[PDB]
Amino acid sequence: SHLFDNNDAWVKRKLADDPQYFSRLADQQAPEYLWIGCSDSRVPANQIIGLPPGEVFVHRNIANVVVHTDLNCLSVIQFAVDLLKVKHVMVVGHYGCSGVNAALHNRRVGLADNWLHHVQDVREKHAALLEDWPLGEARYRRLIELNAIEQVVNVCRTTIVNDAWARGQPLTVHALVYGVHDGRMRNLGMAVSHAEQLDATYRRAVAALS
Amino acid sequence: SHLFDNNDAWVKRKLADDPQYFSRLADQQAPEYLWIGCSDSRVPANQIIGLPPGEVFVHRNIANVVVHTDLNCLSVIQFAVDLLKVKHVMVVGHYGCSGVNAALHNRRVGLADNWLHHVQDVREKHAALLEDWPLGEARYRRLIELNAIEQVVNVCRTTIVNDAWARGQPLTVHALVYGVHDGRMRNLGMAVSHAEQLDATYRRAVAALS
Amino acid sequence: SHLFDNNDAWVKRKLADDPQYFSRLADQQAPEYLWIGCSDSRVPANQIIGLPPGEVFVHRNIANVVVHTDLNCLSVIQFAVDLLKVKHVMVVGHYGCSGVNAALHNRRVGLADNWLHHVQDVREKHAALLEDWPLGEARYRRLIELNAIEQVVNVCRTTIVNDAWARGQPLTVHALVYGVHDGRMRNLGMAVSHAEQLDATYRRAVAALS
Amino acid sequence: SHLFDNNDAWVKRKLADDPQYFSRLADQQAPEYLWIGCSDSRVPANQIIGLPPGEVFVHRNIANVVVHTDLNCLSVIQFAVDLLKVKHVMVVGHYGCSGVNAALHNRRVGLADNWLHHVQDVREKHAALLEDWPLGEARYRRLIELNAIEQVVNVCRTTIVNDAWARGQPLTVHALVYGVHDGRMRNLGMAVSHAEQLDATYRRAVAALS
Ligand SMILES: [Zn+2]
Ligand SMILES: [Zn+2]
Ligand SMILES: [Zn+2]
Ligand SMILES: [Zn+2]
């Protein structure tokens, strides 16, 4: 069957839900959240945050990177924002992220190296900041955290968002991170709602300042 | 708190797992599966297929589209393939997918319209096929199904994959679909392992042929 | 100097223009043409068409490919269209194009292979057509010609364009090709102005029909 | 004819070359230069530098931007480098570039705005530097100049290039700029050949330092 195993672990699943409710999911209304995360899908957005599936609309690229010009992601955002009128977008880094570890420790990898230059660009812009944590684990954490913020800086700079605020659509964009280790999910005091941007982030970034 | 609610529904979650095992996830080894899916993350890859989280490495774009040139996805694939040496890649469409419905019913949407031209391109190439299902629900289904295959045709045409076969890395790429309605997950008889491509797909596509 | 030679062949150039007129170019008004062409910049857009430089606003990618989702090109088009209100956009293939020859003769090349899958996709969709020219030179030509058209089909499907027609901006998009061999530049009877698309192209494509 | 005018200004051109030599261009060997430039194709790469056409292989995007992940450009570079074994790649900004002026003077434009965030990112990283030129013309110039360098920093960070040096292919990448005003073409003392990168650029950047 090639994946006999999986279709098996599946009819197994479908059984486990006697609560005749797949009907309930298929009747679930719009999502009110966009979650951008790492392909290292350690834990599913909803599950973490304790929501029903699909209550969260979801993108996943290596290292939850938002490129100014990556139409893969922007398409996901124009859709979620303009058409599902979600209330909150949120970039979510995760501690122990392979993308960030591979880039931090300038490890050659092949093609994705090119995408991770986007994360190495954050290492650059906060080089100074990252020194006064002379370690590994300390930096690593601080890097994946600052990743999640400069990603939000990227969202909020997208035309889509500016245009959505411009036309008076209520919306807010969070820099957020969660530990596969403890489950526990860190607010970064990064959550933008109009373009009072410079202010709301300096804050978030200063809450490293060794 | 802005999302007080969510951090609440979270410490709630973390409690629910007394089985002191977050340790078990943080110790989880490489994934052996890449799952490309719709941002319409109705259900999390693992959960469906009944696996632990992170056992499945995951990308999500609107309409589980693989572009020949979308480095957002390719980066995800070079990584998963070349570096996590996953055994199986699988594109997974889902019935009732908003991306496919929006494109099928040539609905103006804004920017994502441009990304969905990739799905309208599948509507074109199988125009003939899609007629002899003169309906809606019948087509819609048949379209999202054929989406998942021509996406696999796109993966298998990527340099990454050809190069991985070329250097004798065992790997296989499945066209797959699942119903939010029933949970049940359809094999499409689309699962490629060397470039005997033309053969293995004609098959899969012919299993529509009204 | 590393390129001493070039800065030399340059002060040489600047001399050659006594007609104190660089002033004339720096005072040149908006372009009224967008020209998408092959990086194989055999001949500069303007020169061919006998215009002053900059009278033509210009993009160049391998094989004058327009991707539905390539923001490199779309950015160039939104700019040229929306902001320089150019009257005519035109995709221009060229005979003996390395991109098309490399893809036609399924030659492994490395990364660009992935971009040329876009040209191999045109080879696919007109496979039938391309057979009844059982040769090489005949096909090759016919392929690079059909490239230039399905590229125009891609432009005209872009939101940018539809939106520009929608808001009553006069604009028209030509499928065009030129021979490095003879200089002479072929009209393809492919030049769209509203979305009477299906009509205006069938035409252009039928003018192969061996 | 729609463009009767252009096909006219063309048979006009082809005449003007009695020197029966289109044959000479069609027999022209590989290019030894890649030139990345602004779509604002004020002047054709070759012409400036006083070379025959096609002696220069050419990309053009708004503001001669190199994205880490823009496969439109990277494809052009892998091709030029790996397959035409060009000796020198060179990013070329131009004074009075619309892309840079539009972004510098944070002018809303539509979609290209998103691509120009790449140029606004250079404005950010050298914010300090750009202040001590309290003007307009002075900054503008200094910005388009620094654009051309951080673009080269982007090329040289591409896998393609590192891999080409790694396998002992002789190659060198110049930050370069030219004035539509005077024709004259500025060396920036930015021309990298191995990854002694940090050194060779600090230099180039310091030659602003008001
Ligand atoms: Zn990760
Ligand atoms: Zn979907
Ligand atoms: Zn060409
Ligand atoms: Zn320019």
PDB file of C-alpha atoms in Angstrom, chain C residues 22-205:
ATOM      1  CA  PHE C  22      22.835  63.663 -22.347  1.00  0.00           C
ATOM      2  CA  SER C  23      20.809  66.666 -21.051  1.00  0.00           C
ATOM      3  CA  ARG C  24      18.140  65.582 -23.710  1.00  0.00           C
ATOM      4  CA  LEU C  25      17.980  61.986 -22.265  1.00  0.00           C
ATOM      5  CA  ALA C  26      17.850  63.259 -18.615  1.00  0.00           C
ATOM      6  CA  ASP C  27      14.793  65.345 -19.785  1.00  0.00           C
ATOM      7  CA  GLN C  28      13.083  62.401 -21.597  1.00  0.00           C
ATOM      8  CA  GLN C  29       9.477  62.240 -20.040  1.00  0.00           C
ATOM      9  CA  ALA C  30       7.744  58.894 -19.135  1.00  0.00           C
ATOM     10  CA  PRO C  31       8.216  55.719 -21.235  1.00  0.00           C
ATOM     11  CA  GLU C  32       5.055  54.616 -23.161  1.00  0.00           C
ATOM     12  CA  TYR C  33       6.296  50.980 -23.627  1.00  0.00           C
ATOM     13  CA  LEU C  34       7.055  48.016 -21.316  1.00  0.00           C
ATOM     14  CA  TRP C  35       9.328  45.378 -22.995  1.00  0.00           C
ATOM     15  CA  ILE C  36       9.751  41.961 -21.232  1.00  0.00           C
ATOM     16  CA  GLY C  37      12.681  40.073 -22.864  1.00  0.00           C
ATOM     17  CA  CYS C  38      15.324  37.325 -22.423  1.00  0.00           C
ATOM     18  CA  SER C  39      18.466  38.050 -20.353  1.00  0.00           C
ATOM     19  CA  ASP C  40      20.115  36.870 -23.673  1.00  0.00           C
ATOM     20  CA  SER C  41      20.060  40.666 -24.342  1.00  0.00           C
ATOM     21  CA  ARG C  42      21.331  40.089 -27.915  1.00  0.00           C
ATOM     22  CA  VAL C  43      19.958  43.603 -28.874  1.00  0.00           C
ATOM     23  CA  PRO C  44      18.600  46.448 -26.649  1.00  0.00           C
ATOM     24  CA  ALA C  45      14.764  46.902 -26.855  1.00  0.00           C
ATOM     25  CA  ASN C  46      14.946  50.586 -28.013  1.00  0.00           C
ATOM     26  CA  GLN C  47      17.738  50.007 -30.604  1.00  0.00           C
ATOM     27  CA  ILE C  48      15.796  47.215 -32.398  1.00  0.00           C
ATOM     28  CA  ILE C  49      12.583  49.294 -32.502  1.00  0.00           C
ATOM     29  CA  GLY C  50      14.660  52.427 -33.394  1.00  0.00           C
ATOM     30  CA  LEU C  51      13.662  54.550 -30.336  1.00  0.00           C
ATOM     31  CA  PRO C  52      15.743  56.671 -27.948  1.00  0.00           C
ATOM     32  CA  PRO C  53      16.913  54.782 -24.824  1.00  0.00           C
ATOM     33  CA  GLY C  54      14.531  54.976 -21.797  1.00  0.00           C
ATOM     34  CA  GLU C  55      11.613  55.586 -24.256  1.00  0.00           C
ATOM     35  CA  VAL C  56      11.232  51.810 -23.427  1.00  0.00           C
ATOM     36  CA  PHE C  57      10.924  50.572 -19.775  1.00  0.00           C
ATOM     37  CA  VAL C  58      12.529  47.087 -19.603  1.00  0.00           C
ATOM     38  CA  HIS C  59      12.521  43.733 -17.691  1.00  0.00           C
ATOM     39  CA  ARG C  60      14.812  40.763 -18.613  1.00  0.00           C
ATOM     40  CA  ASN C  61      14.604  37.209 -17.166  1.00  0.00           C
ATOM     41  CA  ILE C  62      15.851  33.935 -18.722  1.00  0.00           C
ATOM     42  CA  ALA C  63      13.339  33.159 -21.549  1.00  0.00           C
ATOM     43  CA  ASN C  64      11.171  36.307 -21.077  1.00  0.00           C
ATOM     44  CA  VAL C  65       9.015  34.243 -18.646  1.00  0.00           C
ATOM     45  CA  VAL C  66       6.045  35.871 -16.836  1.00  0.00           C
ATOM     46  CA  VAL C  67       5.114  33.822 -13.724  1.00  0.00           C
ATOM     47  CA  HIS C  68       1.585  34.396 -12.237  1.00  0.00           C
ATOM     48  CA  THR C  69       3.386  34.858  -8.866  1.00  0.00           C
ATOM     49  CA  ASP C  70       6.920  36.204  -9.786  1.00  0.00           C
ATOM     50  CA  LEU C  71       6.847  39.518  -7.923  1.00  0.00           C
ATOM     51  CA  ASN C  72      10.207  40.424  -9.616  1.00  0.00           C
ATOM     52  CA  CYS C  73       8.254  40.897 -12.896  1.00  0.00           C
ATOM     53  CA  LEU C  74       4.774  41.842 -11.553  1.00  0.00           C
ATOM     54  CA  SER C  75       6.487  44.682  -9.526  1.00  0.00           C
ATOM     55  CA  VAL C  76       8.032  45.849 -12.852  1.00  0.00           C
ATOM     56  CA  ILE C  77       4.488  45.699 -14.453  1.00  0.00           C
ATOM     57  CA  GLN C  78       2.462  47.355 -11.633  1.00  0.00           C
ATOM     58  CA  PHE C  79       5.123  50.157 -11.765  1.00  0.00           C
ATOM     59  CA  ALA C  80       5.168  50.564 -15.594  1.00  0.00           C
ATOM     60  CA  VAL C  81       1.351  50.267 -15.966  1.00  0.00           C
ATOM     61  CA  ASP C  82      -0.058  51.988 -12.793  1.00  0.00           C
ATOM     62  CA  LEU C  83       2.662  54.693 -12.407  1.00  0.00           C
ATOM     63  CA  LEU C  84       4.228  55.394 -15.827  1.00  0.00           C
ATOM     64  CA  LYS C  85       0.802  54.779 -17.495  1.00  0.00           C
ATOM     65  CA  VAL C  86       2.558  53.069 -20.486  1.00  0.00           C
ATOM     66  CA  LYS C  87       0.154  52.576 -23.483  1.00  0.00           C
ATOM     67  CA  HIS C  88       1.484  49.078 -24.574  1.00  0.00           C
ATOM     68  CA  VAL C  89       3.133  46.098 -22.730  1.00  0.00           C
ATOM     69  CA  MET C  90       4.957  43.531 -24.979  1.00  0.00           C
ATOM     70  CA  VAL C  91       6.626  40.121 -24.195  1.00  0.00           C
ATOM     71  CA  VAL C  92       9.458  39.642 -26.765  1.00  0.00           C
ATOM     72  CA  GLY C  93      10.986  36.189 -27.432  1.00  0.00           C
ATOM     73  CA  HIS C  94      14.151  35.941 -29.618  1.00  0.00           C
ATOM     74  CA  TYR C  95      15.140  33.128 -32.083  1.00  0.00           C
ATOM     75  CA  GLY C  96      18.157  31.115 -30.864  1.00  0.00           C
ATOM     76  CA  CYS C  97      17.250  31.856 -27.176  1.00  0.00           C
ATOM     77  CA  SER C  98      19.537  29.684 -24.928  1.00  0.00           C
ATOM     78  CA  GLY C  99      16.803  29.339 -22.255  1.00  0.00           C
ATOM     79  CA  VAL C 100      14.352  27.807 -24.814  1.00  0.00           C
ATOM     80  CA  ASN C 101      17.060  25.629 -26.542  1.00  0.00           C
ATOM     81  CA  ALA C 102      18.266  24.349 -23.097  1.00  0.00           C
ATOM     82  CA  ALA C 103      14.680  23.465 -22.020  1.00  0.00           C
ATOM     83  CA  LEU C 104      13.446  22.174 -25.427  1.00  0.00           C
ATOM     84  CA  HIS C 105      16.511  19.800 -25.453  1.00  0.00           C
ATOM     85  CA  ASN C 106      15.721  18.848 -21.793  1.00  0.00           C
ATOM     86  CA  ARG C 107      19.346  19.811 -20.901  1.00  0.00           C
ATOM     87  CA  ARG C 108      20.200  19.654 -17.129  1.00  0.00           C
ATOM     88  CA  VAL C 109      21.636  23.136 -16.198  1.00  0.00           C
ATOM     89  CA  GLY C 110      21.215  23.380 -12.366  1.00  0.00           C
ATOM     90  CA  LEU C 111      18.822  25.923 -10.750  1.00  0.00           C
ATOM     91  CA  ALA C 112      17.520  27.769 -13.851  1.00  0.00           C
ATOM     92  CA  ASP C 113      16.201  24.306 -14.861  1.00  0.00           C
ATOM     93  CA  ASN C 114      13.425  25.101 -12.299  1.00  0.00           C
ATOM     94  CA  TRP C 115      12.540  28.456 -13.989  1.00  0.00           C
ATOM     95  CA  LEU C 116      12.668  26.746 -17.466  1.00  0.00           C
ATOM     96  CA  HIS C 117       9.999  24.210 -16.270  1.00  0.00           C
ATOM     97  CA  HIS C 118       7.809  27.281 -17.059  1.00  0.00           C
ATOM     98  CA  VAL C 119       8.937  26.989 -20.746  1.00  0.00           C
ATOM     99  CA  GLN C 120       8.697  23.114 -20.608  1.00  0.00           C
ATOM    100  CA  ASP C 121       5.049  23.752 -19.439  1.00  0.00           C
ATOM    101  CA  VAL C 122       4.400  25.503 -22.820  1.00  0.00           C
ATOM    102  CA  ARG C 123       6.099  22.558 -24.634  1.00  0.00           C
ATOM    103  CA  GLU C 124       3.552  20.308 -22.755  1.00  0.00           C
ATOM    104  CA  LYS C 125       0.348  22.364 -23.382  1.00  0.00           C
ATOM    105  CA  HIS C 126       1.141  22.551 -27.188  1.00  0.00           C
ATOM    106  CA  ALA C 127       2.817  19.089 -27.406  1.00  0.00           C
ATOM    107  CA  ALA C 128       0.392  18.075 -30.217  1.00  0.00           C
ATOM    108  CA  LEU C 129       0.944  21.300 -32.227  1.00  0.00           C
ATOM    109  CA  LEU C 130       4.769  20.929 -31.911  1.00  0.00           C
ATOM    110  CA  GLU C 131       4.793  17.336 -33.303  1.00  0.00           C
ATOM    111  CA  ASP C 132       3.536  18.178 -36.859  1.00  0.00           C
ATOM    112  CA  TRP C 133       6.845  20.121 -37.254  1.00  0.00           C
ATOM    113  CA  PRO C 134       8.830  16.844 -36.965  1.00  0.00           C
ATOM    114  CA  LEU C 135      12.208  18.746 -37.096  1.00  0.00           C
ATOM    115  CA  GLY C 136      14.434  20.848 -34.823  1.00  0.00           C
ATOM    116  CA  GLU C 137      14.839  24.442 -36.200  1.00  0.00           C
ATOM    117  CA  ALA C 138      11.061  24.438 -37.127  1.00  0.00           C
ATOM    118  CA  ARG C 139       9.874  23.380 -33.610  1.00  0.00           C
ATOM    119  CA  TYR C 140      12.507  25.536 -31.772  1.00  0.00           C
ATOM    120  CA  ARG C 141      11.208  28.666 -33.639  1.00  0.00           C
ATOM    121  CA  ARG C 142       7.513  27.619 -33.174  1.00  0.00           C
ATOM    122  CA  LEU C 143       8.226  26.974 -29.428  1.00  0.00           C
ATOM    123  CA  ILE C 144       9.933  30.364 -28.717  1.00  0.00           C
ATOM    124  CA  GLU C 145       6.988  31.990 -30.634  1.00  0.00           C
ATOM    125  CA  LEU C 146       4.301  30.154 -28.533  1.00  0.00           C
ATOM    126  CA  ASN C 147       6.398  31.020 -25.419  1.00  0.00           C
ATOM    127  CA  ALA C 148       5.907  34.769 -26.157  1.00  0.00           C
ATOM    128  CA  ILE C 149       2.090  34.224 -26.421  1.00  0.00           C
ATOM    129  CA  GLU C 150       1.425  32.100 -23.293  1.00  0.00           C
ATOM    130  CA  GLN C 151       3.563  34.727 -21.490  1.00  0.00           C
ATOM    131  CA  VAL C 152       1.114  37.433 -22.762  1.00  0.00           C
ATOM    132  CA  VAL C 153      -1.751  35.083 -21.593  1.00  0.00           C
ATOM    133  CA  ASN C 154       0.047  35.294 -18.149  1.00  0.00           C
ATOM    134  CA  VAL C 155       0.339  39.168 -18.167  1.00  0.00           C
ATOM    135  CA  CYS C 156      -3.320  39.563 -19.211  1.00  0.00           C
ATOM    136  CA  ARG C 157      -4.395  37.152 -16.383  1.00  0.00           C
ATOM    137  CA  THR C 158      -2.436  39.318 -13.812  1.00  0.00           C
ATOM    138  CA  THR C 159      -4.727  41.293 -11.443  1.00  0.00           C
ATOM    139  CA  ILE C 160      -2.705  44.484 -12.297  1.00  0.00           C
ATOM    140  CA  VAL C 161      -3.861  44.431 -15.960  1.00  0.00           C
ATOM    141  CA  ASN C 162      -7.527  43.297 -15.355  1.00  0.00           C
ATOM    142  CA  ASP C 163      -7.741  46.095 -12.675  1.00  0.00           C
ATOM    143  CA  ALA C 164      -6.220  48.637 -15.197  1.00  0.00           C
ATOM    144  CA  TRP C 165      -8.855  47.722 -17.854  1.00  0.00           C
ATOM    145  CA  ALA C 166     -11.549  47.639 -15.102  1.00  0.00           C
ATOM    146  CA  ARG C 167     -10.707  51.324 -14.227  1.00  0.00           C
ATOM    147  CA  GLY C 168     -10.784  52.292 -17.965  1.00  0.00           C
ATOM    148  CA  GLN C 169      -6.988  52.745 -18.506  1.00  0.00           C
ATOM    149  CA  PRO C 170      -6.278  52.264 -22.257  1.00  0.00           C
ATOM    150  CA  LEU C 171      -3.647  49.463 -22.563  1.00  0.00           C
ATOM    151  CA  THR C 172      -2.688  46.641 -24.980  1.00  0.00           C
ATOM    152  CA  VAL C 173      -0.347  43.606 -24.638  1.00  0.00           C
ATOM    153  CA  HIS C 174       1.525  42.128 -27.652  1.00  0.00           C
ATOM    154  CA  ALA C 175       3.003  38.614 -28.173  1.00  0.00           C
ATOM    155  CA  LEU C 176       6.126  39.537 -30.270  1.00  0.00           C
ATOM    156  CA  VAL C 177       9.370  37.849 -31.481  1.00  0.00           C
ATOM    157  CA  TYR C 178      12.584  38.996 -33.278  1.00  0.00           C
ATOM    158  CA  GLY C 179      15.465  37.181 -35.028  1.00  0.00           C
ATOM    159  CA  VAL C 180      19.062  37.956 -33.926  1.00  0.00           C
ATOM    160  CA  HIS C 181      19.792  36.383 -37.384  1.00  0.00           C
ATOM    161  CA  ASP C 182      17.947  39.003 -39.619  1.00  0.00           C
ATOM    162  CA  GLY C 183      17.009  41.819 -37.117  1.00  0.00           C
ATOM    163  CA  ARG C 184      13.493  41.748 -38.682  1.00  0.00           C
ATOM    164  CA  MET C 185      10.756  41.566 -35.990  1.00  0.00           C
ATOM    165  CA  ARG C 186       7.641  39.343 -36.387  1.00  0.00           C
ATOM    166  CA  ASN C 187       4.097  40.475 -35.400  1.00  0.00           C
ATOM    167  CA  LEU C 188       2.283  37.286 -34.165  1.00  0.00           C
ATOM    168  CA  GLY C 189      -1.243  38.746 -34.543  1.00  0.00           C
ATOM    169  CA  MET C 190      -1.298  38.690 -30.723  1.00  0.00           C
ATOM    170  CA  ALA C 191      -2.191  42.123 -29.171  1.00  0.00           C
ATOM    171  CA  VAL C 192      -4.936  42.194 -26.451  1.00  0.00           C
ATOM    172  CA  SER C 193      -6.695  45.416 -25.225  1.00  0.00           C
ATOM    173  CA  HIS C 194      -9.793  44.241 -23.235  1.00  0.00           C
ATOM    174  CA  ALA C 195     -10.400  40.615 -21.931  1.00  0.00           C
ATOM    175  CA  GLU C 196     -11.791  39.326 -25.294  1.00  0.00           C
ATOM    176  CA  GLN C 197      -8.798  37.049 -24.596  1.00  0.00           C
ATOM    177  CA  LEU C 198      -9.886  33.492 -25.678  1.00  0.00           C
ATOM    178  CA  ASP C 199     -10.725  34.959 -29.189  1.00  0.00           C
ATOM    179  CA  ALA C 200      -7.601  37.178 -29.832  1.00  0.00           C
ATOM    180  CA  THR C 201      -5.182  34.205 -29.034  1.00  0.00           C
ATOM    181  CA  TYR C 202      -6.818  31.056 -30.546  1.00  0.00           C
ATOM    182  CA  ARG C 203      -6.232  33.190 -33.711  1.00  0.00           C
ATOM    183  CA  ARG C 204      -2.492  33.755 -32.957  1.00  0.00           C
ATOM    184  CA  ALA C 205      -1.980  30.041 -31.974  1.00  0.00           C
TER     185      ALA C 205
END
